[PDB]
Amino acid sequence: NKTGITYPEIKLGETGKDIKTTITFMNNRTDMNLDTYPGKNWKSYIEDFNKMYPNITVKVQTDSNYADSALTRLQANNDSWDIMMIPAVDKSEFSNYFVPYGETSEMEKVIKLADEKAYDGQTYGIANNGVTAGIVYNKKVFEEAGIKELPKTPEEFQADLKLIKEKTKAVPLYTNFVEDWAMGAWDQYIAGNATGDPKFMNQVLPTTKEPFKKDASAPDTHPYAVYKTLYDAVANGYTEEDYSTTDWESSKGKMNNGEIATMVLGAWAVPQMKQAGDHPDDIGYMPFPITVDGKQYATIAGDYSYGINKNISKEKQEASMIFVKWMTEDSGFAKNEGGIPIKADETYETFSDVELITDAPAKEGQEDLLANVNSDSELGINNGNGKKIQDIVVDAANRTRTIDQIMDEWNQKWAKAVEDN
Ligand SMILES: OC[C@H]1O[C@@H](O[C@H]2[C@H](O)[C@H](O)[C@H](O[C@H]3[C@H](O)[C@H](O)[C@H](O)O[C@@H]3CO)O[C@@H]2CO)[C@@H](O)[C@@H](O)[C@@H]1O
Ligand SMILES: [Zn+2]
Ligand SMILES: [Zn+2]
Numbered sequence: 001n002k003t004g005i006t007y008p009e010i011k012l013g014e015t016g017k018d019i020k021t022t023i024t025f026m027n028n029r030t031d032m033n034l035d036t037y038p039g040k041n042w043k044s045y046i047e048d049f050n051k052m053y054p055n056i057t058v059k060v061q062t063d064s065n066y067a068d069s070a071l072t073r074l075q076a077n078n079d080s081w082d083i084m085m086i087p088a089v090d091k092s093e094f095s096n097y098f099v100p101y102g103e104t105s106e107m108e109k110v111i112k113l114a115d116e117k118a119y120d121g122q123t124y125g126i127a128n129n130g131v132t133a134g135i136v137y138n139k140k141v142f143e144e145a146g147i148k149e150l151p152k153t154p155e156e157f158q159a160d161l162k163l164i165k166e167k168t169k170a171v172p173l174y175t176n177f178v179e180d181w182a183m184g185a186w187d188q189y190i191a192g193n194a195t196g197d198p199k200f201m202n203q204v205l206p207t208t209k210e211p212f213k214k215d216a217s218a219p220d221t222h223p224y225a226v227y228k229t230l231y232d233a234v235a236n237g238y239t240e241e242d243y244s245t246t247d248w249e250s251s252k253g254k255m256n257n258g259e260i261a262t263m264v265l266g267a268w269a270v271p272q273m274k275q276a277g278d279h280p281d282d283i284g285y286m287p288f289p290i291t292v293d294g295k296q297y298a299t300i301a302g303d304y305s306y307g308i309n310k311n312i313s314k315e316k317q318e319a320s321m322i323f324v325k326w327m328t329e330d331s332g333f334a335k336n337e338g339g340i341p342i343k344a345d346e347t348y349e350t351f352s353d354v355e356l357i358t359d360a361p362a363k364e365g366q367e368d369l370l371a372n373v374n375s376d377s378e379l380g381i382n383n384g385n386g387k388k389i390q391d392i393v394v395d396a397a398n399r400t401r402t403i404d405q406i407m408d409e410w411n412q413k414w415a416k417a418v419e420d421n
């Protein structure tokens with residue numbers, strides 16, 4: 001764990017000014033690890049970081065398959081890395097792997113989302129950026145299609161997709177099927193966004209046996225409504241022609257240039273689309289098309305969080321925590337990359353009527369319930385089991401199963417796991 005120098009105590013520019021080492025920072029931003037990156041690349045951020053700390057050297061390592069490779073590395077339990085973006089590992093294991101930045105109580109004072117990546121009152125991960133759950137869209141394609149107001153319900157959304165399919169040349173909704181994480185992203189919409197309830201994720205979901213079934217009183221809400229949105233898009237012919245060959249890098253330029261109308265991704269994705277071509281002002285961001293009793297909701301959550309390897313020397317832990325502190329407070333990464341800065345001190349107009357909510361903690365003694373039901377059901381809700389979402393695309397496309405049948409398969413597995421825990 002930490003060496004007696006806590007994240008709130010770091011005097012930026014003062015502390016650790018005497019250290020001379022190299023630290024290794026693993027992250028998912030392969031694009032930023034190139035000199036071609038359209039915006040501010042890693043070299044630049046570290047160029048600026050060294051203006052203030054010339055003798056802390058930072059080796060940036062990036063992997064396209066980040067979730068699996070970071071987890072494998074994490075499980076190897078060595079000192080081959082100093083910082084990584086934290087992969088899909090249960091919070092109860094953070095103590096095994098990561099250095100605590102400090103008591104959550106105190107991190108709250110200095111950072112947003114202090115209890116997102118935390119256990120037993122200590123905060124082990126700091127979000128690199130706060131991201132809102134919405135949809136990236138091409139405004140020009142929408143006009144071309146004669147869409148006037150943005151869709152707020154699943155039926156409105158499919159009607160708009162159909163307009164795009166019939167009156168434009170753009171793929172209405174591009175799944176990015178081959179990217180496991182892009183499919184896993186649909187789970188970022190099923191709790192706050194689909195229910196308006198900040199307690200859904202950590203309380204209602206893991207105490208509900210069959211949460212994926214159609215909500216009978218409000219059938220256009222709740223997780224079913226999200227997953228059906230994907231199913232219907234694929235099955236009605238509103239997605240790419242060949243899901244098996246989607247290409248994520250290509251799709252940026254394609255949406256910039258009007259060849260794609262929508263992609264269901266978090267707000268981090270907007271500037272990446274904007275810089276992919278000459279048509280940045282054509283990219284917008286809209287709320288996900290669910291309305292709950294007259295209001296729309298969008299969950300704010302962390303993008304990848306920084307984690308510090310607990311196996312490294314006291315000296316390397318410190319320089320790591322300093323580079324985090326700097327990235328957080330002085331780099332300006334989070335804006336530049338299209339989200340909410342995490343240092344604790346007005347977004348798209350399309351969201352001005354959206355209630356922004358964040359998941360609340362479980363009740364006392366139930367903090368580990370979701371992770372345990374998730375593990376036993378093997379559904380991996382909001383982990384990066386993109387696999388079950390890939391399953392939706394495949395079966396909607398080959399028409400072998402209805403969404404009701406898919407959701408019932410998940411419920412049976414979830415319901416066993418709920419009773420078991
Ligand atoms: O579900 C985990 C985590 O996902 C975050 O979003 C990530 C993606 O999961 C993915 O790693 C994505 O990587 C891109 C990168 O943005 C760039 O496009 C590069 O060219 O290609 C890689 C993929 O190879 O980056 C985003 C943003 O970090 C985000 O949704 C979190 O809230 C979530 O917990
Ligand atoms: Zn994999
Ligand atoms: Zn895959």
Ligand SMILES: [Zn+2]
Pocket residue numbers: 215216217218
């Ligand atoms: Zn109901």
Ligand SMILES: [Zn+2]
Pocket residue numbers: 293
């Ligand atoms: Zn009401």
Ligand SMILES: [Zn+2]
Pocket residue numbers: 372376421
């Ligand atoms: Zn168990």
Ligand SMILES: [Zn+2]
Pocket residue numbers: 394395400
């Ligand atoms: Zn199947």
Ligand SMILES: [Zn+2]
Pocket residue numbers: 409
């Ligand atoms: Zn199955």
Ligand SMILES: [Zn+2]
Pocket residue numbers: 419
């Ligand atoms: Zn029971």
Ligand SMILES: [Zn+2]
Pocket residue numbers: 418419420421
């Ligand atoms: Zn029980």
